[PDB]
Amino acid sequence: NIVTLTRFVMEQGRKARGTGEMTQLLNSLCTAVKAISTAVRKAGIAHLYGIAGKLDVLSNDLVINVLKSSFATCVLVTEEDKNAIIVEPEKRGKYVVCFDPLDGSSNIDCLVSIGTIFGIYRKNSTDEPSEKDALQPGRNLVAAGYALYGSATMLVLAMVNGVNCFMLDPAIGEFILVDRNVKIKKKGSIYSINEGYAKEFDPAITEYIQRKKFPPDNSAPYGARYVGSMVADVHRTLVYGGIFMYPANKKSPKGKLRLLYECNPMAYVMEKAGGLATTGKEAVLDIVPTDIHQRAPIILGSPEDVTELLEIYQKHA
Amino acid sequence: NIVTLTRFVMEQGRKARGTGEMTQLLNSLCTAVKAISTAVRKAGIAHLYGIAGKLDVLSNDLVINVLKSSFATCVLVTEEDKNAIIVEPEKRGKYVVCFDPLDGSSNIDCLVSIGTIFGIYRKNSTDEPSEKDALQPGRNLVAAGYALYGSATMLVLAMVNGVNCFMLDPAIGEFILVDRNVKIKKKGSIYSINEGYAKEFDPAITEYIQRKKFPPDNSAPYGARYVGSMVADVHRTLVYGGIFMYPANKKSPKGKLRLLYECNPMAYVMEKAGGLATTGKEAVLDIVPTDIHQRAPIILGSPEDVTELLEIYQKHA
Amino acid sequence: NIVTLTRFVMEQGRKARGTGEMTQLLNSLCTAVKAISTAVRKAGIAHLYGIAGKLDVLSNDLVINVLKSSFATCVLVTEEDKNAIIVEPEKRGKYVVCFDPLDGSSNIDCLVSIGTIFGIYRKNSTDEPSEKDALQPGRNLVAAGYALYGSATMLVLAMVNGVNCFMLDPAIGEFILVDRNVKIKKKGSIYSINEGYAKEFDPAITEYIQRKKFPPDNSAPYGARYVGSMVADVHRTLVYGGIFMYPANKKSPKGKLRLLYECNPMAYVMEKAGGLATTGKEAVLDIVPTDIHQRAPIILGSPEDVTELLEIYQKHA
Amino acid sequence: NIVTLTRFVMEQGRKARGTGEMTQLLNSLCTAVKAISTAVRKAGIAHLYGIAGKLDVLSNDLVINVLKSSFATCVLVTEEDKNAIIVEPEKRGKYVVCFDPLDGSSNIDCLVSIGTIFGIYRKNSTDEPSEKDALQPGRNLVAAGYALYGSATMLVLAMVNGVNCFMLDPAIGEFILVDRNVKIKKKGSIYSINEGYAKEFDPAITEYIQRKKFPPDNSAPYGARYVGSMVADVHRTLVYGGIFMYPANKKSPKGKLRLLYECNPMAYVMEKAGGLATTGKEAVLDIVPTDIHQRAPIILGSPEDVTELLEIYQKHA
Numbered sequence A, B, C, D: 001n002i003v004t005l006t007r008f009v010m011e012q013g014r015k016a017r018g019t020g021e022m023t024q025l026l027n028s029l030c031t032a033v034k035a036i037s038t039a040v041r042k043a044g045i046a047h048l049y050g051i052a053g054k055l056d057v058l059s060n061d062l063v064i065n066v067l068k069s070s071f072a073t074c075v076l077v078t079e080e081d082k083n084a085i086i087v088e089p090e091k092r093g094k095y096v097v098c099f100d101p102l103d104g105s106s107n108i109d110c111l112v113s114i115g116t117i118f119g120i121y122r123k124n125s126t127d128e129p130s131e132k133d134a135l136q137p138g139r140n141l142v143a144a145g146y147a148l149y150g151s152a153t154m155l156v157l158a159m160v161n162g163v164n165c166f167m168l169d170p171a172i173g174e175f176i177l178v179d180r181n182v183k184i185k186k187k188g189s190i191y192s193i194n195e196g197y198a199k200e201f202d203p204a205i206t207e208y209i210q211r212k213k214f215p216p217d218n219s220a221p222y223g224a225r226y227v228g229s230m231v232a233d234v235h236r237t238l239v240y241g242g243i244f245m246y247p248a249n250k251k252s253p254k255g256k257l258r259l260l261y262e263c264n265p266m267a268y269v270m271e272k273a274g275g276l277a278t279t280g281k282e283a284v285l286d287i288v289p290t291d292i293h294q295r296a297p298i299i300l301g302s303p304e305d306v307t308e309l310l311e312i313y314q315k316h317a
């Protein structure tokens, strides 16, 4: 007995008495992710080096085309695209998909772990599809998750029912359910943040970090980790517990991370896992988007760690 | 045209006029690296999950076995083995290999980049091979390098004539020379260190760090990055420039990283690349080891960055 | 735009307003076939040769376990199994699957193309499942097809709607629809038969062959081809046209090929393609099985070629 | 222990005391074979089918390019090229390679086993390399063998010291020595020939064939097998014993198969394996060619079987 992503999705679609439109969608995503994974591990690079005689772009095209061919979407929002992609009426479905085809594109040259981030909305309204359909608060997410191309490829899927992790067996090109109904640690022992912006941190953030290195109660300090790729940092948080942070500073007073295809999908995954995702002031998933490429500060991870910072945030209020 | 590791290695062996003994060794190493990469990528995991019909220990076995069969080694030092392995008189060769089969094994469950580290010495004290033969300063390295199992697999090889990077094309199981004679930037813009040990840093490290976040002349501060995997962090340093640091602290008064199979190979690669690798007080490669599992502090990266920290070390003494 | 087997099956299940039970079944088969394909191409053979320190049996276990885990079957008939496999009431579905996990097992050692043959029946009755449920004439087939592990892996699926061919892209482990609604040639130019049994052929067969080598109308003779693996021979017939034959002789007066999991699936595929499948006397698909391992003579291929022999058969009646 | 082609080849080069020039050649060949196997298995075909973002010509380019870069060849003869290719003075070596990049190209669309055939001569007439250098009897072969892309990929290598079979482990892209010093059965029980040419067979062939179906002393008749792919049929002959025949006929008065890149390599492999390879009148390897694309009749296989046919040839003369 072994559970594959294809089996899992189908059984979940069956229990939910769906028309099978969303299952077609999730199966198309699974395929896109396997295609991207293969391109990322450099299969066929020899030909590029003349054996017989861009990566973010290839990833964008793969997701966009595999998604359109699902006949289950009406609007697509990509980080690589200025405007939202409205699906041809021939292949038009009822879902809105926001995604980041290849996050951590800067890390590509250094071979650091990268990934794909996606969020699925059910179109709410009854008129010609437009960018306005993507502009829904993260709380309205039908499904969300990510694919991490690290030492191994893994797809983390989060739905109303919970969070489940699927490992890619590259030998047979099938995702195996290796961890079901994942719940995050209450309190971790690692903080993640680009301390190279110390000079720009607000007093609350500055205080929290200081508390981590120099525990006032003289407990053991927190270990530091900052890969540089959100999917890698956040996935480690989900699995090992702790706190990831990318608050505002000179690098945009609105933070760097995007709301629709980065913050929301990860916040959704986090909350479903039993953790928190805040901007320091409000819950990320309750923000009403104003633009499809709207940025937003984010602090996420173990509940007890995120709450501790939230208090320090209140102190300086 | 297309250059494969196999062709490159043989070609170099010929120019060098070797008896082809080292070529056999480097060829065996290459084979061990492709076997580990495959295991790491989780190929065939569906079989563990009951489709019907460890990773560090497996990596250890692969490297040991594949090396012994090369008939080119006499002494082997693994991080996984308390004692140095002495090869059978039947399979003995003139080379001593010091390696770390799978480095960053804590990051495995989190799916973060990991790797293999190797250092090759030539047994000169023609006596019965013993542990003593591995106890040579890194200055005596014949060849050294590493394999990074990140988003893609790469093998960095360093020898007297330079450093060369080989990307693995998993389709055909061939390493392609993607970068020739690699040389690191004089000055970088990223510092790498576990700041969670701030409470235990010596005044030199403490001053340098704060100088990176708050630059005297108001210039751009350095970005921070700390994957938690030496091979990953050092490769980023090599490719993008900057400085990696794992100084001595209370928990590790002599540092955490090992001299023979971690510090030395990376120090050797750094020097051949045109960078510096120091203990803070002296060059890593000149240290004459006393224990095969001897630890050593390490600071490496761009020359200009490493020098700056070395001056601060001189200032506080 | 590209069609995958997973997409195809789902859309076909949707048009047919199924409960999704048979789709779960076809998806489980797709997975089993990819697993077998990988084992056949020898991935991981190095470990068997001690790098770090039966095939028909593995194939049987894979299909049996992957099928049971579909929760869509009640009875399974395998060539490798003396008795039919009755599914545990926990995983019991409504379908009966007859199959040959690895046909041409004798050819394995010679590396000749081999394959998998399957036929799907819908249980007809309302009582405890038993072998009796498998004993239905081939005309009652819901679906049938085969997987050919040759120069490339291909799955041919035949249903009431038609015959469609899917090519396995081993890089992403996905079956691509490369040929839809396949129809066989009216008249081919190749005959396939083990002429090493000439001494045992009945006069009709003997006459046909003679007509092929020495055309009475002085037309061009037929080329000969006999791979030795039914799936390979039959697939070539389906694609290039011609006639495949395995009539009775001293090698059992009932022929060698099995009715349920070899003759029927291939006859079904053939008829759906626009060809014929006969025992010389009757249509293969109309035979009422008496035993699950019942053998049956078979002549299949292009209509005009099969009819020509049928006449010669009548002449000698 | 585990023996890889790479290790085996180098080891043999060392014992032979070669300048490592031929080793480079055999290493390049090996690389070309893994590239062809991958293309043949249809890896990445999903990209032709619009997932968004020949085979014989491609195989030709791969072999030519990978061989030229080995800096070990001066003259190349391909079935795909009318004229012999003369390597640039810059990349020239002392070896002449005669090859058939992808044999059985008619069987491609039918997915039947196909392969690569190669013969290696040493240029002895030290003059400007020309077509003349390839015109040497197969008796002058330094090395010969083939790659079979069947159910699994295998590389058969034959040299003065014997014939060795290497199985490809596609996971790690390594050829493993699965069979050492291969030697064919004295007598087989399978005859291989296209009997569709019965109307044009000489009385010797005709008598031998009928003697196989109707044995004088009532013994068991021979089984028939004719894949239609030389490499596949010859490999079956090598592994299981028997006789392969492609005699001269009206359509091919001098046979169909080429001397330099088909007959010779297989004849060489046969002789080293302990079998016989005849034209019916003389040994294939002793023929001094006049044309690079010269055809030649061929009969090969177990010694006892080939001898029997040779006696019948003597009887009718």
Ligand SMILES: Nc1ncnc2c1ncn2[C@@H]1O[C@H](COP(=O)(O)O)[C@@H](O)[C@H]1O
Residues within 6 Å of the ligand: A009, A010, A012, A013, A014, A016, A017, A018, A019, A020, A021, A022, A023, A026, A122, A142, A159
């Ligand atoms: N694979 C599935 N897994 C879980 N829920 C699903 C699945 N498919 C559909 N649903 C649900 O049923 C609703 C409508 O599905 P659908 O008819 O396919 O568009 C969805 O939005 C979810 O509530």
Ligand SMILES: Nc1ncnc2c1ncn2[C@@H]1O[C@H](COP(=O)(O)O)[C@@H](O)[C@H]1O
Residues within 6 Å of the ligand: B009, B010, B012, B013, B014, B016, B017, B018, B019, B020, B021, B022, B023, B026, B122, B142, B159
């Ligand atoms: N592949 C090679 N590349 C560069 N130098 C080599 C190679 N093989 C051997 N050498 C060198 O020649 C010395 C002796 O080689 P060997 O005779 O193979 O043990 C080595 O220790 C290096 O100095």
Ligand SMILES: Nc1ncnc2c1ncn2[C@@H]1O[C@H](COP(=O)(O)O)[C@@H](O)[C@H]1O
Residues within 6 Å of the ligand: C009, C010, C012, C013, C014, C016, C017, C018, C019, C020, C021, C022, C023, C026, C122, C142, C159
């Ligand atoms: N994937 C499918 N493709 C074509 N027909 C299907 C599919 N699934 C179910 N059917 C059909 O609908 C009947 C009952 O399906 P089911 O409810 O899934 O057992 C089948 O036996 C076929 O007639």
Ligand SMILES: Nc1ncnc2c1ncn2[C@@H]1O[C@H](COP(=O)(O)O)[C@@H](O)[C@H]1O
Residues within 6 Å of the ligand: D009, D010, D012, D013, D014, D016, D017, D018, D019, D020, D021, D022, D023, D026, D122, D142, D159
């Ligand atoms: N890998 C090898 N295995 C067996 N014999 C070899 C090998 N390499 C070279 N030789 C032989 O030594 C001769 C000259 O080799 P080379 O100096 O490499 O051109 C060859 O033509 C063969 O006789």
Ligand SMILES: O=P(O)(O)OC[C@@H]1O[C@H](COP(=O)(O)O)[C@@H](O)[C@@H]1O
Residues within 6 Å of the ligand: A102, A103, A104, A105, A106, A107, A194, A228, A229, A230, A231, A246, A251, A256, B223
């Ligand atoms: O994909 P991008 O545009 O290159 O950025 C990725 C994001 O960039 C963040 C790190 O940025 P800093 O270097 O400012 O810390 C990560 O958390 C995210 O992956």
Ligand SMILES: O=P(O)(O)OC[C@@H]1O[C@H](COP(=O)(O)O)[C@@H](O)[C@@H]1O
Residues within 6 Å of the ligand: A223, B102, B103, B104, B105, B106, B107, B194, B228, B229, B230, B231, B246, B256
């Ligand atoms: O393989 P190990 O024993 O788990 O250690 C890996 C090393 O551990 C260092 C980080 O350890 P800290 O958490 O102490 O910083 C990295 O630089 C190296 O990769």
Ligand SMILES: O=P(O)(O)OC[C@@H]1O[C@H](COP(=O)(O)O)[C@@H](O)[C@@H]1O
Residues within 6 Å of the ligand: C102, C103, C104, C105, C106, C107, C194, C228, C229, C230, C231, C246, C251, C256, D223
């Ligand atoms: O799988 P098996 O039991 O080894 O047999 C395979 C079948 O065996 C037939 C050939 O048998 P002959 O050698 O008698 O021709 C093929 O047509 C079929 O693939």
Ligand SMILES: O=P(O)(O)OC[C@@H]1O[C@H](COP(=O)(O)O)[C@@H](O)[C@@H]1O
Residues within 6 Å of the ligand: C223, D102, D103, D104, D105, D106, D107, D194, D228, D229, D230, D231, D246, D256
């Ligand atoms: O590559 P080609 O030109 O298509 O020919 C392949 C050869 O053709 C022979 C069979 O041809 P016939 O159909 O004439 O028997 C086989 O033995 C060889 O593989």
Ligand SMILES: [K+]
Residues within 6 Å of the ligand: A056, A079, A080, A100, A101, A102, A103, A104, A105
């Ligand atoms: K991006």
Ligand SMILES: [K+]
Residues within 6 Å of the ligand: A079, A100, A102, A103, A104, A105
């Ligand atoms: K991004």
Ligand SMILES: [K+]
Residues within 6 Å of the ligand: A256, A257, A258, A262
């Ligand atoms: K971003």
Ligand SMILES: [K+]
Residues within 6 Å of the ligand: B056, B079, B080, B100, B101, B102, B103, B104, B105
């Ligand atoms: K380790």
Ligand SMILES: [K+]
Residues within 6 Å of the ligand: B079, B100, B102, B103, B104, B105
């Ligand atoms: K380590």
Ligand SMILES: [K+]
Residues within 6 Å of the ligand: B256, B257, B258, B262
């Ligand atoms: K260590």
Ligand SMILES: [K+]
Residues within 6 Å of the ligand: C056, C079, C080, C100, C101, C102, C103, C104, C105
């Ligand atoms: K079988």
Ligand SMILES: [K+]
Residues within 6 Å of the ligand: C079, C100, C102, C103, C104, C105
């Ligand atoms: K069989």
